[PDB]
Amino acid sequence: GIFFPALEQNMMGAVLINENDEVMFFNPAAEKLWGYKREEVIGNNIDMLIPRDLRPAHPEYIRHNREGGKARVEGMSAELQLEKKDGSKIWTRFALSKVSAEGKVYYLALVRDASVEMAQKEQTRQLIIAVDHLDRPVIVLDPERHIVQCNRAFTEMFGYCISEASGMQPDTLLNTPEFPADNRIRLQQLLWKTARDQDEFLLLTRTGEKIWIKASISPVYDVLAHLQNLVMTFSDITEERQIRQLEGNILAAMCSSPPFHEMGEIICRNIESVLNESHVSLFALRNGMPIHWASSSHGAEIQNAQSWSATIRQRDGAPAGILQIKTSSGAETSAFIERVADISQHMAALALEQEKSRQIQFDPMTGLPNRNNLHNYLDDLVDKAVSPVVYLIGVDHIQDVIDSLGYAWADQALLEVVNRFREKLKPDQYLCRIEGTQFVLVSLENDVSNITQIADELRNVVSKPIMIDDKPFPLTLSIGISYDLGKNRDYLLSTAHNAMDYIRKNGGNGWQFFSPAMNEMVKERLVLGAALKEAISNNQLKLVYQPQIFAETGELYGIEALARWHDPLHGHVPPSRFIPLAEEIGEIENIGRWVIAEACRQLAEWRSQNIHIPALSVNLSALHFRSNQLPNQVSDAMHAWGIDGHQLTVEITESMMMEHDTEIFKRIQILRDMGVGLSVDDFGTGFSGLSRLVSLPVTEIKIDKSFVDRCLTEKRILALLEAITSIGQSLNLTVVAEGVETKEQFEMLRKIHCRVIQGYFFSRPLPAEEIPGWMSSVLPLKI
Amino acid sequence: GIFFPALEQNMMGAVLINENDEVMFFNPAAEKLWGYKREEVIGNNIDMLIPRDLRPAHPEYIRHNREGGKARVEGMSAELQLEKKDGSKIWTRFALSKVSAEGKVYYLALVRDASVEMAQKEQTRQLIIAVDHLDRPVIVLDPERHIVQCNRAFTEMFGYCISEASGMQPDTLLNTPEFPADNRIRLQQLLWKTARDQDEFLLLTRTGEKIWIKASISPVYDVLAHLQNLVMTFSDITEERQIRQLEGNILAAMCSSPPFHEMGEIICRNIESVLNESHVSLFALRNGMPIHWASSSHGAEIQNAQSWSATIRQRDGAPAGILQIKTSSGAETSAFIERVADISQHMAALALEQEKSRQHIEQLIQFDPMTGLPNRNNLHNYLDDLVDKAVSPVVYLIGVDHIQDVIDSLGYAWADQALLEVVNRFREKLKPDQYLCRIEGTQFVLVSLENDVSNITQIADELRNVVSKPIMIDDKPFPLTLSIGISYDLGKNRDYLLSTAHNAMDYIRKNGGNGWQFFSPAMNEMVKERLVLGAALKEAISNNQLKLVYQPQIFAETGELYGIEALARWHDPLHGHVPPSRFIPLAEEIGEIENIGRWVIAEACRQLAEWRSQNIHIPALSVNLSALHFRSNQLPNQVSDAMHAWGIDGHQLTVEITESMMMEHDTEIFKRIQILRDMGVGLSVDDFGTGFSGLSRLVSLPVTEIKIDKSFVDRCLTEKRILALLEAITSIGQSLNLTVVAEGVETKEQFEMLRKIHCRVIQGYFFSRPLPAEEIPGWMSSVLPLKI
Ligand code: HEM
Ligand code: HEM
């Protein structure tokens, strides 16, 4: 029987009904839930307890129950509304039990006051407000830094729904692009920071888009100070970071007060970097009226263009300029555009303040002179009637340095550039710094060949990357050359800058003159060089041989081999012309090895009929023979053909003997070790040079055409020739002469006991043929 | 009874225990909750259901309740923690009953699973925490506009808590203004009409302050229509203007570029201006630790202030500073303080980047824009490099004296020009190893690598003589003077060098100027010695105290004497022997080279005229002009007078020239040597020169003979290419009628092998040390032709 007293003692409401729905038990909890009294809750069936409207449904329901046959009731499992005795309606929960005994079915109902519905509804309200009219990504974290609750804005922005965002840390949840250092490590630092903190990151959503966000941690502790949870805000600063980077770049601009138009340029390209595919224009108040300050390089039409005009205002509020922007409709949000407009307007006003706040003779950066020194120097050149060739050099691709590293490294790059220019500067060449990027190089040599060489040297001096702290920014040069006779300095500077700008705009990395005719003359020289390269490539050049003979018996001493080139398109062109051109092309080694190889082959070819050919001499000084060529360039020819090695001789000048390094000295020594005779020009530089001469057996000294010339006119050179022949006779050397054309020359030269003679007197240079004819016909010309 | 199956069939968890505290009822819900099958729980004690953490403290409460006998159990009114069979923990609610039946005590327990219930509870708590951290004040409303849920932003915006304004109508709590009828009517309509309104109104706080607020009522419409809930999102439209104002003002501070400390101060004062009462401090990180940058002067204590820490980040992102702001609690909400922290952090990072940029630019800026010489930083770098090279420098500190008077009198327009031509005169006498710098104003620095005092005094003398010609400015003379302090010490760092050099600078300046000095009496006594040595040398030249010592030279195969070479000497009663290699440089420094040259030539001519008395005697005589530093205005006149005053045929004497000075340069002493050749003086050379031009000048005017320096012949035996050079020289001499001579031949082997290559005359100790002038006629006719 204890069920009744226990149930009425229990604070859970209990109602008991029989098969006829008559009530037997109704606990005081049910009494206070309904308001009726047990003397009346019986009544007729269950009429009093049920709300009057739902009444008719209830019998059929329980009828269905006694027809259902199920041992469990799925009904009343949800929340329910109960009408009280006074007609008020409250929330409640029900539970049901069906029993069978004595052939009759009874039911018991348990009732609860439902104090949890207040919690459910309050939770629904704050679930509404966490999302509604607030696109504010907020997430919350456990002590283990696990996502516990995230709102609609966060799922919408970062694509990861709550089902796919829970149970894992935010960083592991987050797809992160590879900085690779910062945007990875600082995320972990912030996510594990214990105190309030914040940072900025670049992140990738589930759609692969790049965004910039700002993440803030602020933890919360319970009463006992243990860490309960953490809360994180996820503002999207991808538009704001553009504004902040705009600010940083523009400040790095005015840090050094560049010129006015330049300042407009930084403003404009920063705006363009901020507003994609737009147009920007600026005007400033000069003399009281608006005048154009700067504009963007873009000038194409804009579809659905929207224009905003902002009047620049100073601190006092007086107008100072107008900034105008045109943007396509739908490209950017309006609020972002207006924000950019006003912040840039403020910075333009500040730039104007700096400009009118700003408003000796050498450079305090690298030490080069400033524009005043160049002006004075050119003026001192002009008054005494000398034409200076003026190169204007503009350094290019510095904008990468300025944008990526500010000015404090652009000027370091400029210093490195100036060091490289000075390292190869020649004296009388004047280097000056005009302003910022530009330089002016002044040189008095008006030769086109030298000008081309200087320009090429400058262009290629910047070939190596400019190494600045493990960051090779490549830089280029744009050179404008001006040279005209009898023109003052302003014209030269103006045309130099015009040429520099022309090269820069068309792409840079190059050079150009101003005068058009000789700017085509350089092209024609390049054409000649192309023809010469073709000729040397397909071995068309020839070697004309000129004989030199003894002055006593007339027996053949030897014959020099001289390069010659006759072209169908260009005709005869002398070696004195196409050797300097060759070194301009820098292909002298080709001519050298071809000349050597062809001479060896020709000696072999002559050997098949007559071996009596005494000696063949190649003048390597006039051929501008380099240093490293000698060993291989002689050894390959020696071994390739049937030439012995004691028949062909090589000539070297004194400057090339022991100057411009000394590796060439032993490179000639090894060639002597091969056994090829040598020939020296001056043998000077004192007793050391003489020691080298005797130690390197030369066996023959040549007298240049000039000394033999005027030999019958100037007494000093006469005595010099006596000295030379006396020294030669003393040692084991045979002295040769060049440029002999008359009879008195030969007479006096033989009078001084000069051994052998060459020139036009005996034989005009015969071509590759009719040398055996000359040798068989008139070889013993006992004159 | 039917209640046993009833409780068997309730969703409720039914358990009953008897007096023996043994469980005798268990239901499917108990199966879900406890996890133990009824076959395991029936017959088990109540302690089975008790969790571990309370087992020792289980029964006493039930004893106590039994003793009390109260029907309404006070306990189990709270939440309970139950442990499952597998060890997991869940939360359950209990409903109890005490039964006194059949003369016994029974306890009935009913267990409900509130896992959903408390999950809802913690979800509510988490959501409260989350909504409180929203940057903007937001409120929920019921259909009749019950203010049901506010958040911390709304509390910190007005003052109301959840309990204070819980469902009590907004118009009554909002404390709307009474005077503006239009404002209050519009606000009431906004609260009432169910459109998406974004109107703005003035509202009042507990401090009686009128604040602009934008309401954003956006009612919700459920799926069943008949909208119920409304959502309000108040915003402050006066804080944003203040943030923009702070941005602009701090950027204007940026643009004038004050120094680091001034800018930090302006940042903090602006922040304090925004937040009515606050203290702001800034730390800039150096080497990982924070150096104080600036804090506002309002250092008064704040009662229960709230701090805020932001980590300033560099342009790349490396942390660079800490910013801490403290404001009195309740003055501003969390959002406004966080926003000002963010805006200020960006600008502080800008200031740090600008300061770093200026540090990098100034490290290499200012290399004397006026005259172009290197400036003090360049000098410090160069001296540091020299010290790292372990090479001791000599540093001159140079100061101009009279320039300050002209500055005081004629201003800068003359001083700048004067210093300009001073530097111009200096540069005309530099050297490749000499490095000039302009430390400051009218002070300069010269750096050299010469440690011999003989060179140092000469350098100082030419520098002093730079101003021998007074500066010409606008037809006006200005005789500026110099005061120079030299420092040179091994191992001392650069700072000591500059410090002591400036000490010597001051010492030689305040004494009157126009002078030079060392700083150490340990190196100044040398120059003090040298002045009197030079005075003695001048006295000796005047009184003719010197001596001439004769060394002969004889033939290499004949044995006869070819001639004699004249050498000069000095014996003094104080300093004793003093060699020519130490008093010809001294004669140079006094500029008495002309006098000693004249004395040697005149004495040689006198000896020849005296020796002609007995017989013809001497074949030929030589004087080394190169060793005597003879100048361009000394040869012809001195030789001509020497051989005119006495009687000399000219064939007797020869002069030796190093051929280095024989170059035309700017003197053209070719005419002088040609004149000397015309008057019969023999000539001697040592090298040919550049090339054919050199041989031409050697053979045009006939150089009688050529000498091999002692350096060559001292190494002839060891090296072969010396021998080749020797044979070449001898062959050239034979060819051109040149008389090769050798100086310094010592032993017999050298003489024999030089005879093998026909050197043809030998001069050295091997036949005679240089004898005094008197023993010679006692040697010409005693040792005789030496045919060894
Ligand atoms: C004022 C008190 C009551 C109200 C307002 C009420 C209301 C309802 C309602 C709305 C349903 C259908 C949906 C649902 O179950 O949630 C229902 C079902 C049912 N009720 Fe009641 N009820 C009350 C009392 C009782 C009592 C005391 C008993 C038996 C002792 C009972 C027996 C049943 C049965 C058997 C069903 C069928 C559930 C099914 O078929 O799934 N009801 N009741
Ligand atoms: C997981 C199982 C249980 C836990 C964790 C537990 C724990 C507690 C605790 C700590 C109290 C005292 C403080 C309070 O009520 O908030 C209490 C009250 C009480 N519980 Fe338990 N108990 C458990 C099971 C039981 C069982 C199985 C019974 C009886 C069949 C029982 C009977 C009582 C009684 C009589 C009181 C004191 C009532 C009063 O003083 O008014 N408890 N329970």
Side-chain angles (χ1 to χ4, degrees), chain A residues 19 66 106 157 162 237 269 297 325 360 368 401 429 431 470 494 524 543 561 576 713 735 779:
Chain A
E19 73 273 24
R66 56 213 71 257
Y106 324 104
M157 186 177 286
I162 165 69
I237 56 130
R269 334 149 291 163
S297 57
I325 59 177
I360 286 327
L368 303 183
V401 194
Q429 292 190 5
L431 200 37
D470 207 25
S494 48
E524 86 71 16
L543 297 177
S576 87
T713 305
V735 201
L779 193 67

Side-chain angles (χ1 to χ4, degrees), chain B residues 17 34 46 49-51 54 58 61-62 64-65 70 72-78 80-82 92 94 96 107-109:
Chain B
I17 70 155
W34 269 281
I46 182 178
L49 317 171
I50 308 309
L54 209 55
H58 162 55
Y61 304 96
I62 310 177
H64 181 72
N65 193 275
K70 49 191 177 192
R72 281 258 63 79
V73 284
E74 188 169 13
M76 311 295 248
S77 309
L80 278 303
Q81 190 34 67
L82 177 133
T92 53
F94 281 76
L96 208 63
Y107 254 123
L108 180 86

Side-chain angles (χ1 to χ4, degrees), chain A residues 2-12 16 71-72 94-99 101 106 108 110 112 116 119-123 125-130 132-134 136 138 140 142 148-149 179 182 186 196-200 214 218 220 228-229 231 233 244-245 247-249 251 254-255 315 342-343 346-347 350 360-365 403 408-409 412 415 681-687 690-691 694 701 707 719-720 723-724 726-727 730-731, chain B residues 1-3 5-6 9-12 28 71-72 95-99 101 108 110 112 117 120-121 123-131 133-136 138-140 148-149 196 216 218 220 228-229 231 233 244 247-248 251-252 254-255 308-309 311 313 315-319 338 342-343 345-347 350 354 357 360 363-372 686-692 695-696 699 706 724-725 728-729 731-732 735-736:
Chain A
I2 86 173
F3 25 74
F4 296 134
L7 276 191
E8 62 89 20
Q9 282 148 358
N10 195 1
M11 83 319 297
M12 171 210 38
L16 171 71
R72 307 298 176 83
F94 272 45
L96 203 38
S97 76
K98 169 216 285 179
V99 292
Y106 324 104
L108 177 74
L110 319 174
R112 299 308 352 279
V116 317
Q120 276 218 4
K121 175 33 61 183
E122 81 186 71
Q123 166 301 332
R125 304 142 180 291
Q126 37 202 259
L127 212 61
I128 274 165
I129 166 69
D132 172 317
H133 209 75
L134 219 53
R136 287 259 65 219
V138 54
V140 309
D142 262 332
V148 200
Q149 188 262 314
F179 178 86
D182 284 39
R186 27 189 51 191
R196 173 258 198 281
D197 205 344
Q198 77 164 28
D199 210 353
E200 311 66 20
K214 158 174 279 162
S218 305
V220 56
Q228 222 185 355
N229 285 319
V231 163
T233 309
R244 321 313 304 184
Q245 235 181 36
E247 271 315 329
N249 296 5
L251 255 299
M254 40 293 301
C255 83
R315 298 186 194 229
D342 85 283
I343 168 179
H346 195 3
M347 301 278 319
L350 293 166
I360 286 327
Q361 188 307 339
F362 258 98
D363 162 49
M365 171 55 48
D403 278 347
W409 282 66
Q412 275 271 19
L415 190 52
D681 305 4
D682 181 28
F683 80 65
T685 44
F687 275 166
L690 249 184
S691 59
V694 184
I701 298 201
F707 296 154
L720 181 32
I724 294 170
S726 313
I727 311 309
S730 83
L731 297 166
Chain B
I2 69 181
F3 283 81
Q9 281 169 246
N10 320 339
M11 160 274 267
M12 181 22 61
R72 281 258 63 79
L96 208 63
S97 282
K98 151 80 148 63
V99 186
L108 180 86
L110 284 321
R112 199 168 290 104
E117 180 180 358
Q120 210 65 266
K121 294 302 321 313
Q123 175 167 168
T124 323
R125 199 186 50 79
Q126 265 142 2
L127 282 157
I128 289 158
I129 272 283
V131 51
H133 282 90
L134 283 166
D135 201 83
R136 216 201 321 299
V138 315
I139 318 288
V140 186
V148 280
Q149 285 180 358
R196 179 32 202 70
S216 285
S218 324
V220 84
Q228 49 178 262
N229 267 131
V231 189
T233 312
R244 265 280 306 147
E247 190 78 349
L251 261 173
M254 217 61 228
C255 280
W308 218 229
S309 76
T311 88
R313 314 239 163 175
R315 172 69 173 180
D316 53 8
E338 186 267 350
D342 253 28
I343 282 319
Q345 159 203 83
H346 181 257
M347 294 277 173
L350 286 186
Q354 172 154 14
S357 302
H360 191 102
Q363 183 261 347
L364 66 96
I365 210 61
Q366 91 258 48
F367 284 14
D368 183 28
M370 155 143 175
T371 323
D686 184 34
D687 265 17
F688 303 162
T690 68
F692 284 148
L695 188 56
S696 64
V699 86
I706 175 165
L725 189 31
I729 300 177
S731 57
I732 287 157
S735 68
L736 312 184

